[PDB]
């Protein structure tokens, strides 16, 4: 995961030569300078008469990116006749396969062809060129008197290569014996020492080779791919030979004893043409010192969720056991045609964590199929099948795509840090890329608190700025900078300690540190060598009990870590990274003993009582009601303390009053659950003994209907505690009452009348308004001002009429509205006024005989106006006095009322009574 | 009166067609900014716009030709018909659609396009001789399956490269069999000889004209040949309107992807056609073999069934390859290949369980959504096909033809055809966004009552 793709060392050669077919790394005992090897099969060179011979070029990884040919030769074809190749170095693909060890480089030409003096037939024997220091040797055991396809003529030695521990050379020759194949193996030392340039059929004394097989194995290609390892227990490494068309095109991998070409182990593919054996690699994946064998099968067809066959490529993993009984897992490509089995190669210990591992190439994957290489760690039980990181080609196809990862090598520490890189070929782009690894540090961090249980009275720490002491605790932070390979001895770790993380986000800060007087502290820690778990200690301050009501909620202490980079990096800028599976979030929880007596059992004494601010609710409107609820804690404290009150829906809860500083500010919810109506206040979950919380609960009581004489609220306080969870219930009632003030109003339309009315004359029997006099409309009204409606009232009117024997006001019509019905004792409109189209001074009802008019008034809503209008005429005869001039008069009527019945039958009811005088000034 | 386009289409002569199929636009001053505009056809019609100035296209689904579907392939004279609608008239307005359906029957008669791809290795010289009676006889037996069958021919001899070919170690192998007192051909990879033709007697002659070549490496180049025969529609003569039967005739195991490494062939096979003007696969020396994955994808995508006419001794590999190349079939070939006629007739009968549609020459602006009736009256959305049918069974596809935006005023022909079948539905599609109202406009300052503006499509602007 530590392999970057940001600053790779990018290698390339001349276009069309296919640089990238095979890669390797050269590390001679001769120097501190190492070189990358990249093969280029179609390369042109100096050798006269030879085209597309191929070449392997050596490149200095420290900048200096120029690649240069290895001088394995310079001459043209070995002759026999002049200018007649005895060997054809043209179109041979040199660099198709490249491998080295120490100061020896052996490059392959699988299409190297020979002429045998015996018969004029060109044969695809395949050979290698060995560069030993400055000495050059032709390696070709595949060339012998066995001139054709029946023989070794078709070996095509060179498709696969490796070396054993010490010095044996493994040359795969898949075309041998009618393409059954053959693995050719010899000590490189014998090859160098016994070589005679005038003989092209040199046999070696220690030469081993797979024997010719039955026709059963025709076209199997043993030698397509090869690897080495300690498969047959200890001793010399064995040979891992891929044979992709063995087992009827399923493919097989054979492991041959390194000392004798006789099969030890046999592995096979599950699917036809998967090509099980394209890539055979071996490594000790579990870190238990035994090589396993990982077999790529790039054409493997998997099955998707829809049953579709998906060409993804497979890597078949055979995990070694002492008994030779291999266990197995499978890795597979993700994308279609992203041939994942194309290459497997050692990465070595990518994190320096004790596990050897590999990387997998899927050369034709990615949108814009550049090729993807999958990097993951080994495990004691197998491979981590899921990539942590991938390397990807950065180049577009010129024609064919680069096929990134087609060829691959690794498990070499090229730079100063002992974290191996990956050399990933890209032959379709004439390129190879070195992806560098960062150091990987596993950091074991720990956080401990000694007095994990707190006591608020243990005030033993001095606070630096006061004469006062503090109850406190010791927080310890340790660090282990573990890492292998080469990493700087001293690592720089940045650590921050956060106290009370869960309360800082808007709640009261329960705890701070003594010296910084804040909930946080940080330091840059220098941790050296690994295992040196040095530490720092901080002392925390528990906040004063007089302000902080919290007793049960834990105090959490957190460590937050960052591994630095510039200050922990080497001279090439190769910064470390922490191990991908290591957390940087470490914590401990501390708690305070919540009272709980001497026996550590919480035994609360929960009690509640209330104070009513208002004693009455009036019926018919929304009556505010605030009740102060007092929550006591007379015993031990409590867990998840709450105030619960059962409230009739008719009493609409508004909230907890925040307009009085003498009261606690309690959060409060309103809900209905399982046929209930409730108000719930937050008394503080972690409650302490002695806490007194008072709060006002404000309601709006509607109750407009014919309800009970009081509104009842049922209150209790409770907890989730082990003992005594609920307080006794306090039952609170607020009286309900009928309030129905009614205002009696009235007015005479005109306030006054002037006697000299134009054309106003006396008639023995008057008709129409003109012969009677002015019309005055007297308005009487009952208005419901109070909130309570009523069912019945009466409006009583006394209309002055006969002063002495003079009839003054004749009622034309009673215009009434609302639920009103008038009954009169005396005849109304005795004068037959068909008009429509609408004690001397005070002519009161106690002076002039009055008419008694009583109006029944029915049900009236609050705010309703019950109206009585009396339209009447002033008759001339009774105003135009005859006895002595005239007098100013006040014509005075009187309207009284009495509200009798309310629908609120079960409530106290008071009669509502009053009266208004209505007058006209006649002058 | 006022209905949608009353406020959304009055400002535009075209938008009103785009907004609703029920709206109409008067012209020639029928209602010269009278009061209502656009509304519905009927509202303007009543308010003095009854004459055809209303220019009222609506979306329409009509059938131009519906010759009935046939029961038997033997029902000659009137053309045996495999599908029900033949020609359809579709009129769309912007952002709208119309429904139609395609009834297809597996009549005992859909057409067959068969390609005879032969192994031209030396052991087959006697097969080329036996095959001189085929084409004519193959088609004759097939006449009972369908009245219309075409036969082509090609061959394979493997990649002409160093390790597969006898390497041209000498010159002697540039024109081989000098070794045994005879002569034979050089290696060529994949060759195409005869495109499919109804004149099947041409095959008899074309095979007589052929002769074998020499292969050192026993595995055949059959997978390149199959993939090219599968992919190169333009030369093989595949009519989309016909079933494609690729017959692979051989006496040996095939060469597969990444085996090509032995010749220096490492180039991935992209599944593309590489057959040039010489009817030859030019990629035979640079490209690797296709994988089972590529074969499956291309033959499935393009509706090619493979028939493996393979001799008994190598059947195990071909049957196992078929399991990883779904949709294909493998039979057993006689050493004298005299049973190809029966092998194919049987293979065809075994293949016959699918109906799938393809729409040719569809423009980017129109989307055809399918719901396929695979069983009884149940339809599965997103399908152009149904599986599990027998000869004589039918399938019914429900299709929605929707247009996005307002494509140019050109008639397009959408050909909806079963793959496999001659008969197809030609849907002729036009777009009613552009109509007479646009031409019928004379702004001229005045005409917008007392003012200075424009006037179009029955409304001043």
């Amino acid at each position, epitope marked *: 995961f530590n392999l970057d793709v940001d600053s790779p060392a990018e290698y390339s050669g001349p276009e069309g030569s296919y640089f990238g077919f095979a890669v390797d790394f050269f590390v001679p005992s001769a120097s501190s300078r190492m070189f990358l090897l990249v093969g280029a099969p179609k390369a042109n060179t100096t050798q006269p008469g030879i085209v597309e011979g191929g070449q392997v070029l050596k490149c200095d990884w420290s900048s200096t990116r120029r690649c240069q040919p290895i001088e394995f030769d310079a001459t043209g074809n070995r002759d026999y006749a002049k200018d007649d190749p005895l060997e054809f170095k043209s179109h041979q693909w040199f660099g198709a396969s490249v491998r080295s060890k120490q100061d020896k480089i052996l490059a392959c030409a699988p299409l190297y062809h020979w002429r045998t003096e015996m*018969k004029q037939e060109r044969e695809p024997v395949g050979t290698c060129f060995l560069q030993d220091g400055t000495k050059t040797v032709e390696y070709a055991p595949c060339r012998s008197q066995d001139i054709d396809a029946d023989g070794q003529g078709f070996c095509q030695g060179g498709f696969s290569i490796d070396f054993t521990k010490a010095d044996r050379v493994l040359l795969g020759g898949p075309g041998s014996f009618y393409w059954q194949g053959q693995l050719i193996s010899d000590q490189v030392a014998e090859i160098v020492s016994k070589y005679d340039p005038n003989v092209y059929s040199i046999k070696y004394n220690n030469q081993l080779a797979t024997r010719t097989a039955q026709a059963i194995f025709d076209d199997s290609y043993l030698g397509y791919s090869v690897a080495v390892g300690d498969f047959n227990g200890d001793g010399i490494d064995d040979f891992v030979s891929g044979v992709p068309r063995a087992a009827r095109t399923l493919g097989m991998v054979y492991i041959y004893d390194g000392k004798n070409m006789s099969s030890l182990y046999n592995f096979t593919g599950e699917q036809m043409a998967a090509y099980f054996g394209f890539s055979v690699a071996a490594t000790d994946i579990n870190g238990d010192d035994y090589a396993d064998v990982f077999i790529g099968a790039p054409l493997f067809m998997d099955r998707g969720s829809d049953g579709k066959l998906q060409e993804v490529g497979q890597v078949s993993v055979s995990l070694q056991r002492a008994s030779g009984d291999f266990q197995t897992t499978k890795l597979n490509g993700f994308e279609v045609f992203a041939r994942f089995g194309s290459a497997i190669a050692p990465l070595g210990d990518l994190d320096q964590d004790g596990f050897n591992d590999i990387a997998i190439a899927a050369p034709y994957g990615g949108e814009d199929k550049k090729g993807i290489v999958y990097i993951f760690n080994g495990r004691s039980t197998g491979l981590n099948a899921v990539p942590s990181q991938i390397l990807e080609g950065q180049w577009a196809a010129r024609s064919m795509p680069p096929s990134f990862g087609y060829s691959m090598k690794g498990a070499t520490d090229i730079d100063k840090n002992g974290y191996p890189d990956l050399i990933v070929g890209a032959f379709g782009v004439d390129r190879a890329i070195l992806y560098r690894a960062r150091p990987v540090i596993t950091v074991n961090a720990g956080l401990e608190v000694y007095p994990s249980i707190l006591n608020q009275d243990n005030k033993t720490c001095s606070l630096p700025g006061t004469a006062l002491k503090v109850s406190c605790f010791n927080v310890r932070f340790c660090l282990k900078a573990d890492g292998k390979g080469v990493l700087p001895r001293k690592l720089n770790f940045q650590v921050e300690l956060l106290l009370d993380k869960l309360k800082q986000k808007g709640a009261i800060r329960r705890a701070l540190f003594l010296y910084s007087r804040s909930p946080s502290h940080s330091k840059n820690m220098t941790i050296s060598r690994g295992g040196l778990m040095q530490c720092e200690e901080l002392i925390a301050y528990l906040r004063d009990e007089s302000e902080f009501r919290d007793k049960l909620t834990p105090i959490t202490i957190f460590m937050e870590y960052r591994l630095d980079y510039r200050t922990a990096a080497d001279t090439t800028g190769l910064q470390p990274i922490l191990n991908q599976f290591t957390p940087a979030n470490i914590s401990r929880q501390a708690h305070i003993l919540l009272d709980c007596g001497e026996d550590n059992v919480c035994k609360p004494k929960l009690e509640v009582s209330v104070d009513s601010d208002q004693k009455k609710i009036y019926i018919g409107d929304d009556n505010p009601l605030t009740l102060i609820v007092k929550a006591q804690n007379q015993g031990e404290g409590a867990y998840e303390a709450e105030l619960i009150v059962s409230i009739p829906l008719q009493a609409d809860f508004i909230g907890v009053v925040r307009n009085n500083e003498a009261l606690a500010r309690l959060s409060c919810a309103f809900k209905t659950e399982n046929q209930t109506r409730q108000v719930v206040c937050d008394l503080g979950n972690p409650m302490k003994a002695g806490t007194q919380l008072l709060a006002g609960l404000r309601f709006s009581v509607h109750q407009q209907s014919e309800m009970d004489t009081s509104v009842k609220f049922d209150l209790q306080i409770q907890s989730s505690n082990l003992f005594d969870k609920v307080s006794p219930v306090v039952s609170h009632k607020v009286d309900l009452a009928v309030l129905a003030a009614v205002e009696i109003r009235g007015v005479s339309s005109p306030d006054h009348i002037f006697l000299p009315i134009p054309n106003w004359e006396h008639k023995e029997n008057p008709e129409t308004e003109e012969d009677v006099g002015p019309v005055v409309q007297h308005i009487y009204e009952l208005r419901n001002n109070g909130p309570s409606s009523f069912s019945k009232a009466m409006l009583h009117l006394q209309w002055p009429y006969k002063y002495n024997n003079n009839t003054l006001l004749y009622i034309l019509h009673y215009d009434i509205d609302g639920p009103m019905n008038c009954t009169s004792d005396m005849e109304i409109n005795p004068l037959r006024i068909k008009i429509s189209s609408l004690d001397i001074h005070t002519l009161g009802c106690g002076v002039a005989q009055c008419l008694k008019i009583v109006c029944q008034v029915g049900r009236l809503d609050r705010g309703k106006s019950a109206i009585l209008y009396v339209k009447s005429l002033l008759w001339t005869e009774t105003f135009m006095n005859k006895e002595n001039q005239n007098h100013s008069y006040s014509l005075k009527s009187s309207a009284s009322f009495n509200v009798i019945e309310f629908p609120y039958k079960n409530l106290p009811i008071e009669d509502i009574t009053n009266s208004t005088l209505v007058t006209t000034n006649v002058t | 009166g006022p209905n949608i386009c009353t406020t959304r289409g009055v400002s535009s002569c075209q938008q009103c067609l785009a907004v609703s199929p029920m709206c109409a636009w008067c012209s020639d001053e029928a209602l010269p900014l009278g009061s209502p505009r656009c509304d519905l056809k009927e509202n303007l019609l009543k308010d003095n716009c009854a004459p055809e100035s209303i220019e009222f296209p609506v979306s329409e689904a009509r059938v131009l030709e519906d010759r009935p579907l046939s029961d038997k392939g033997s029902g000659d004279s009137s053309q045996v018909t495999q599908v029900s609608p033949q020609r359809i008239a579709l009129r769309l307005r912007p952002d709208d659609s119309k429904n139609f359906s395609i009834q297809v029957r597996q009549v005992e008669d859909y057409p067959v396009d068969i390609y005879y791809l032969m192994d031209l290795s030396y052991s087959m010289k006697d097969d080329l001789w036996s095959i001189q009676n085929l084409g004519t006889k193959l088609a004759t037996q097939m006449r009972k399956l369908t009245s219309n069958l075409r036969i082509g021919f090609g061959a394979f001899v493997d990649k002409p490269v160093s390790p597969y070919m006898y390497i041209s170690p*000498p*010159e002697a*192998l540039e*024109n081989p069999c000098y*070794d045994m007192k005879t002569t034979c051909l050089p290696m060529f990879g994949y060759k195409h000889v005869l495109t499919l033709t109804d004149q099947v007697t041409r095959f008899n002659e074309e095979v007589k004209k052929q002769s074998v070549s020499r292969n050192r490496d026993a595995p055949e180049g059959g997978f390149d040949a199959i993939m090219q025969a599968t992919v190169c529609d333009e030369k093989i003569g595949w009519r989309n309107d016909a079933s494609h039967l690729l017959v692979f005739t051989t006496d040996a195991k095939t060469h597969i992807a990444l085996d090509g490494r032995l010749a220096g062939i490492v180039q991935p096979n992209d599944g593309q056609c590489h057959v040039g003007s010489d009817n030859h696969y030019s990629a035979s020396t640079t490209m690797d073999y296709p994988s089972l994955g590529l074969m499956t994808e291309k033959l499935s995508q393009k509706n090619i069934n493979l028939i493996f006419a393979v001799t008994e001794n190598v059947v195990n590999l071909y049957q196992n390859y078929s399991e990883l190349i779904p949709g294909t079939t493998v039979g057993v070939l006689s050493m004298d290949s005299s049973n190809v006629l029966q092998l194919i007739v049987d293979a065809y009968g075994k293949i016959r369980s699918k109906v799938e549609l393809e729409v040719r020459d569809l423009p980017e602006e129109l989307s055809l959504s399918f719901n396929a009736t695979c069983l009884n009256n149940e339809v599965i959305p997103g399908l152009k096909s149904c599986m599990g049918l027998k000869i004589g069974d039918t399938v019914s596809f429900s299709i929605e033809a929707k247009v996005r935006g307002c494509p140019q005023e050109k008639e397009k022909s959408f050909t909806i055809k079963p793959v496999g079948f001659k008969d197809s539905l030609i849907v002729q599609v036009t777009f009613d966004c552009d109509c007479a109202c646009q031409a019928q406009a004379e702004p001229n300052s005045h005409r917008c009552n007392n003012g200075n503006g424009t006037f179009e499509c029955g409304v001043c602007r």
Partner: antibody, heavy 117, light 107 residues
């Protein structure tokens, strides 16, 4: 070193018969094809007949076929050519030769055959 | 098939260079060999397969060509190069030889 030696040439009356032989050594005789080439008095070389390494396939010049037989004994390392119904056209120096894939890599010294009355 | 070989005769002074030309009536790919024959001696293979020399044949002798037209070039002709030259076709039965070229040394 390859050694080829022809013998048995001489004067044959027209319509007669004659057997030529050619001994061989210095090589794996049974691993190579063999042929006879004759040099016509006009100094023109003409290929006459070829026999495959195992003796299985034998090819003859069209104007020779039906009259001559080419054969070999791979145990005795000796090549033979049995001529019959000889005409004047058959007078020539006959040479045995070893093949290298269509070329005549090695030749004998030649045995002269005269057809005349 | 007919193999035409020209020139029939050639007179070359030592140190000068020459060439011979082989014409086939049809294409014979690279199935063309060249031989030399000195007085009272048998023919010897010079060049095989149109351009591949043999084992002890001088570089001075160089074959070239394909299909229908082949050559044999001899650089810096030596006295010892005197003698007949023949081309031979190995493509199709019967094998055929060219008429042959008689190389003479000019003195």
């Amino acid at each position: 070193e390859v050694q080829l030696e022809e013998s048995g040439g001489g004067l044959v009356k027209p319509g007669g018969s004659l057997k030529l032989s050619c001994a061989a050594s210095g090589f794996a005789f049974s691993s190579y094809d063999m042929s006879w080439v004759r040099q016509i008095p006009e100094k023109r070389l003409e290929w006459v007949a070829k026999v495959s390494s195992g003796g299985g396939s034998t090819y003859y010049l069209d104007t020779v076929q039906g009259r001559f037989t080419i054969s070999r004994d791979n145990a005795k390392n000796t090549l033979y050519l049995q001529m019959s119904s000889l005409n004047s056209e058959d007078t020539a120096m006959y040479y045995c030769a070893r093949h290298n894939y269509g070329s005549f890599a090695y030749w004998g010294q030649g045995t002269l055959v005269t057809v005349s009355a | 098939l007919v193999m035409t070989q020209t020139p029939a005769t050639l007179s070359v002074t030592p140190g000068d260079s020459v060439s011979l030309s082989c014409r086939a009536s049809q294409s014979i790919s690279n199935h063309l060999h060249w031989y030399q024959q000195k007085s009272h001696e048998s023919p010897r293979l010079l060049i095989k397969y149109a351009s591949q020399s043999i084992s002890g044949i001088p570089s001075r002798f160089s074959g070239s060509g394909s299909g229908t037209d082949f050559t044999l070039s001899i650089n810096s002709v030596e006295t010892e190069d005197f003698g007949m030259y023949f081309c031979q076709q190995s493509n199709s039965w019967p094998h055929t030889f060219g008429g042959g070229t008689k190389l003479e040394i000019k003195r």
